[PDB]
């Protein structure tokens, strides 16, 4: 393996145009980096410009309308760096990127099935063109450009505060390690807890998990509260460790907060003390202060490109050492023989592969295929000896071991290599179908056909006609993902295929495409009557053309066995817009169930308005500041400063404090509604239909990826995002008020231009988090094709249509190149339009504030303290604006769980009120007039009117013939799913009335595949009964023949086991879950099939413990029942689902069993 290549080789795909735009796109991202530190230096200039000449009104007004003009031009400047930085480095990433898979695609397919066998495998194929997004469309496409622009920001930065102010740059530059520390120390202790938590939420998700994969025993023994209470025990520990994560970023937060107030109070003193001696300006100290921050910020956001870039050297070495290779097949260079003839006489003297994955072995040794031309010759044999291997060896993938393959006498070695697959047409078990058009897919074969032959590849082989009637088109691109479901019709289209393909040598094969239709008929009426006869190996049906080929050509052990007539038989075992008054009305819902938290969620909304008040106060002191800097009493400055600074330590501790109420109080509602609404929905989904769980759309582990998805992106949301609201909204209340109160009028020309800043700044967001899109999806199709071709290598490499394939390649990564160039530029000019409007819009406020300084109107100080209070209330407006993204997507997932709780089930296993049951029964259950009971696939129709009758205290023993619905009456009498017009009388009433936890404990069912509970087999027979203790659990093993073995575990008597842990052997689960049912002590025992393939004693062992535990009570037992059937009274043989004599195993009436149950008997022995 390597561990990635230079940073240089990563640009060994770009031509000139990409040099071009990677040097304008890197001068962008400098010129933009250095900017941001040259606006806080003229920031700088022009609060010393307004402040310093309170007295000289004209020319502070003049010099203020100078630093004006100095902001536009800074402006401009942005807007010209960020629209190249952005478009130069997303347009050159993607030219890059696109070439690169494009070469990584060709190089890949040129590749021999040997590379694809011992080398770098297919799947590993496709995840390297899956992941070529982070390899170059991440490091070198945007991350190059952020960490060009990030890096000059640092330099930017420092070198504007050290000119400025070299003390203040030193003690700010000693200063922010200190918070880098405490934020690290924040962010670890988060990720810790929240990984912790996630692994809490994972056991919750594997227990929702298991219980909807085994809802059928859950169900049946009403183990939904069991479920319940398993769900929401893990829930608690999850939110146990919630309330820590709470803390945790309370805690953090709260000392960020604690460490910057206190520091800056410290740092504001010593500007205040840098102004006392005339070393520099007040401005410069803050401009020094801001820009220091700016550039650790700056590298901070810089190391995430450094680790791209690690990660994409890495996966770039993967594609350079895939490219890098060259086929070994090769060595001929087409320099062969392109004049042989088309009567192909194919001999091999030896027919060994040695397949690479599994070397040294010789599982072919000596088969002579030695096919005559013109006579359609047979191949059968084992999978173990597999034959489509004697295929590769006529497609020469040049495996030689010993012997030599001649066609018509001539060596394939030595041969073309190219018109050899011309001739030679193939169709395997797959049809080998791609992503493109299906005319595309039929032409690949010969490239230079035209329509009418096209046309004509499926008109005389196979069927036109339903493309012909197909509701789409005449063209298809293959629908969107798969146009046919049932896939005959992709056996057509590939056949058709061949056929544009010439039909000189055909290697038809087994076709094992689980046919029950038409296309078996068409199958034999295309190329069945072919003029010609080659290879053909058919191993679906044990008739199929197989009588029709004259030459067996039986293949076992490595070596052809009897060839010729084909009468004989072989010793063989072959068998054959949207409206947001909804989701105001979803969100209400959502607070009003969540009352009983409201208190403590309105605490933590307290504590957020104190922090948004404390930031805006922080604002306001440093605005202060900053007046206080320019005021010629000393002393009164002095003053000033240490009150402020005290203040600023006041406003540090309390931030600490209602920082830590505030996220601890949040994330405490939230865990409790996350909690809350994680058990509704299990309460909801354990009282669905049984149809519900058997629904496509509700997999078992999409229900819990469901579940655990919606319910904490709702609680992440819901939560983090209200309380950044509230906090942001008090900040830009208090904020507002502030700057009203002390100076109008400036406050509304700066609110004036609120939009723009908030705008501006919402792109800034936006572009820290990157402007690309959804990467992966960008070359889906692409990627879907390129993986399609890779899997099917084989076929690529039979059709000689690698580079048919590479140019649609091209044809599907053009609109990538194109869609990609475009956003780039629009970005780039969005980008760059708004910082420009955010810096005309802060010029426009200073110069409005010095025009009012210079007309009377007001002073410097509440100018600039108005000023500044507005820019923070416009930051924390924009990081609201950037965070409604996550109340859209809150709001989806708290539709999607209200949909899941508010549906309504038809049958209902906690009634409010029904019936009363009988504490006994006598157990006899009829079914009248009962239905297929599977809303899944109603078409499929089972039980044609079924009437069945038990007896009190006496088995039923149904066995039917196989695919029945043999293990589904059990269903009905349990309520799983509901007859639409049958009847399922119990104690003389029907169920439906009565109620349904109550009764379903009156019976116990042992399922086909019996399942396991937790991880040890004390739990399940446990769950079987409450009752279950111990001693009943025991004699209930000893009536199933379980407590001897149990008793015998290799460790004590509850062992590892389960579907998460070590599952033990057939016969003991089924010995188990057959205890368990009798520790339900149920009047009513249905059973079902247990001796698959369980051993002789074991078998005789279960037949004992079935009889006891239907001589315990009324029973109903479905398994084949071949001998010791207990004398059932009757047995229901339907056939189909018919009505039909009950004849029983003791032979009352030899009418009915004499005609089905003898003969199977007679095949079982």
């Not at 089924?1070 to 049912?1077: H, P, T, V, Y």
Request: a neutral charge.
């Amino acid at each position: 393996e390597i561990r990635g290549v230079a940073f240089k080789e990563l640009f060994r795909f770009a031509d000139g145009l990409d040099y071009v735009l990677m040097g304008i796109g890197s001068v962008g991202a400098f010129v933009h980096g250095c900017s941001l530190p040259l606006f806080l230096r003229f920031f700088a200039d022009l609060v010393n410009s307004f402040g310093s000449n309170s007295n000289n009104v004209e020319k502070m007004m003049e010099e203020v309308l100078k630093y004006a003009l100095y902001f536009l031009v800074v402006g401009a400047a942005i807007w010209a760096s960020s629209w190249a930085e952005i478009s130069c480095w997303m347009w050159s990433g993607e030219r890059q990127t696109t070439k690169m898979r494009i070469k990584y695609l060709e190089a890949a397919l040129n590749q021999d099935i040997q590379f694809f066998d011992t080398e770098v495998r297919t799947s590993d194929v496709v995840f390297a063109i899956n992941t070529d997004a982070v390899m170059v469309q991440d490091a070198i496409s945007e991350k190059l450009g952020n960490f060009i622009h990030y890096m000059a920001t640092f330099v930017s930065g420092f070198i504007v505060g050290f000119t400025a102010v070299w003390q203040l740059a030193l003690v700010t530059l000693a200063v922010v390690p200190l918070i880098a520390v405490i934020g690290g120390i924040h962010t670890t202790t988060l990720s810790k807890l929240s990984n912790k938590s996630q692994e809490s939420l994972s056991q919750a998700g594997n227990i929702v998990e298991q219980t909807v994969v085994q809802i059928r025993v859950v169900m049946a023994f009403v183990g939904e509260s069991r479920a319940s209470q398993a769900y929401s025990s893990a829930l608690k520990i999850a939110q146990k460790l919630g309330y820590k994560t709470g803390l945790a970023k309370g805690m953090g937060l709260g000392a960020t907060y604690f460490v910057v107030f206190c520091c800056y109070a410290l740092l504001l003193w010593y500007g205040g003390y840098l102004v006392r001696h005339h070393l520099t300006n007040g401005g410069l100290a803050i401009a020094t202060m801001f820009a220091v921050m700016i550039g650790g910020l700056a590298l901070g956001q810089s190391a995430p490109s450094m680790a791209a870039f690690a990660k994409a050297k890495v996966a770039a070495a993967k594609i350079f050492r895939i490219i890098d290779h060259k086929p070994t097949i090769e060595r001929n260079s087409e320099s062969g023989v392109e004049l042989d003839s088309v009567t192909g006489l194919v001999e091999l003297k030896n027919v060994d592969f040695s397949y690479p994955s599994r070397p040294d072995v010789k599982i072919l040794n000596n088969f002579c295929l030695s096919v005559p031309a013109g006579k359609t010759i047979a191949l059968v044999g084992s999978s173990g000896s597999g034959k489509s291997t004697v295929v590769s060896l006529i497609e020469r993938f040049y495996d030689p071991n010993s012997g030599q393959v001649l066609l018509d006498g001539q060596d394939l070695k030595t041969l073309k290599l190219r018109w050899l697959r011309q001739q030679i047409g193939l169709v395997s078990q797959e049809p080998a179908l791609f992503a493109t058009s299906i005319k595309e897919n039929i032409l690949l074969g010969r490239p230079d056909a035209d329509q009418v032959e096209i046309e004509e590849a499926a008109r005389v082989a196979n069927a036109h006609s339903f493309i012909i009637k197909l509701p789409d088109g005449f063209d298809t691109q293959v629908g969107e993902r798969g146009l046919q479901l049932s896939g005959g019709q992709k056996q057509r289209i590939a056949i058709a295929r061949a056929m544009l393909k010439n039909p000189a040598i055909l290697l038809l094969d087994e076709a094992t495409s689980a046919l029950d239709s038409e296309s078996e008929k068409l199958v034999q009426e295309a190329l069945d009557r072919f003029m010609i006869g080659r290879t053909t190996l058919i191993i679906a049906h044990r008739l199929s053309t197989i009588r029709k080929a004259d030459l067996v050509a039986v293949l076992q052990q490595g070596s052809v066995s009897e060839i010729g007539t084909h009468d004989e038989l072989f010793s063989k075992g072959e068998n054959g817009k949207l409206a947001f008054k909804d989701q105001a009305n979803s969100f209400w819902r959502l607070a009003k169930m969540n009352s009983p938290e409201w208190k403590y969620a309105l605490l933590g909304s307290v504590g957020s308005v104190i922090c948004g008040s404390l930031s805006a106060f922080f604002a306001y002191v440093l605005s202060a500041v900053l007046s206080v800097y320019y005021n010629p009493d000393h002393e009164y400055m002095i003053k000033q400063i240490d009150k402020y600074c005290y203040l600023l330590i006041g406003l540090s501790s309390a931030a600490l404090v209602f920082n830590t109420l505030q996220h601890s109080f949040w994330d405490i509602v939230g865990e409790n509604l996350t909690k809350r609404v994680r058990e509704k929905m299990l309460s909801a989904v354990l009282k669905n239909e049984m149809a519900w769980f058997d629904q496509e759309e509700n997999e078992s582990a999409r229900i819990a990826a469901r579940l655990a998805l919606d319910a904490n992106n709702v609680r992440s949301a819901i939560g983090d995002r209200i309380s950044v609201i509230v906090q942001n909204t008090a900040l830009m209340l208090v904020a507002c008020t502030a700057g009203f109160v002390l100076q109008w009028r400036l406050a509304l020309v700066l609110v004036a231009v609120f939009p723009v800043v908030v705008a501006a700044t919402v792109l800034q967001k936006m572009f820290m988090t990157g402007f690309s899109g959804d990467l992966e999806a960008a070359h889906a199709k692409g990627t879907q094709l390129a993986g399609e071709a890779i899997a099917n290598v084989r076929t690529v490499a039979a059709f000689n249509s690698e580079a048919k394939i590479v140019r649609l390649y091209t044809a599907n990564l053009e609109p990538p190149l194109k869609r990609c160039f475009w956003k780039g530029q629009i970005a780039g000019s969005g980008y760059g339009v708004a910082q420009f409007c955010l810096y005309a819009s802060y010029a426009l406020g200073l110069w409005y504030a010095s025009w009012l300084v210079k007309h009377g109107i007001s002073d410097f100080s509440k100018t600039i303290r108005v000023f500044m209070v507005l820019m923070v209330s416009a930051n924390g407006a924009a990081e609201t604006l950037t965070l409604a993204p996550d109340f859209i997507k809150g709001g989806q997932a708290m539709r999607s769980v209200f949909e899941l709780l508010d549906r309504k089930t038809e049958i209902e296993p906690d009634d409010p009120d029904t019936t009363p049951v009988p504490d006994r029964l006598r157990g006899e259950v009829e079914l009248k007039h009962i239905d297929f009971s599977y809303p899944s696939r109603p078409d499929i129709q089972i039980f044609r009117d079924l009437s069945l009758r038990a007896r009190a205290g006496k088995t039923l023993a149904l066995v039917g013939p196989s695919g029945c619905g043999k293990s589904s009456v059990i269903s009905l009498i349990q309520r799983f799913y509901e007859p639409s017009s049958g009847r399922v009388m119990i104690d003389g009433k029907d169920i439906r009335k009565y109620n349904l936890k109550a009764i379903r404990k009156h019976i116990a069912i042992v399922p086909q595949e019996p399942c396991l509970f937790g991880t040890t087999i004390y739990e399940n027979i446990a769950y079987g009964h409450e009752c279950a203790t111990e001693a009943e659990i025991i004699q209930a093993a000893t009536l199933a023949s379980a407590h001897k073995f149990i008793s015998a575990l290799p460790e004590g008597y509850k062992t590892y086991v389960g579907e998460r842990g070590v599952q033990l052997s057939g016969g003991q689960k089924q010995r188990i879950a057959i205890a368990r049912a009798l520790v339900r002590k149920a009047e009513i025992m249905l059973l079902d099939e247990a001796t698959s393939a369980l051993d002789a004693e074991s078998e005789r062992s279960v037949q004992e413990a079935l009889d006891q535990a239907c001589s315990g009570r009324t029973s109903i037992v479905v398994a084949h029942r071949l001998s010791t059937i207990r004398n059932a009274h009757v047995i229901a043989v339907i056939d189909d689902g018919k009505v039909a004599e009950q004849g029983s195993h003791s032979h009352l009436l030899k009418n009915h069993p004499d005609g089905i149950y003898a003969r199977m008997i007679q095949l079982q022995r």
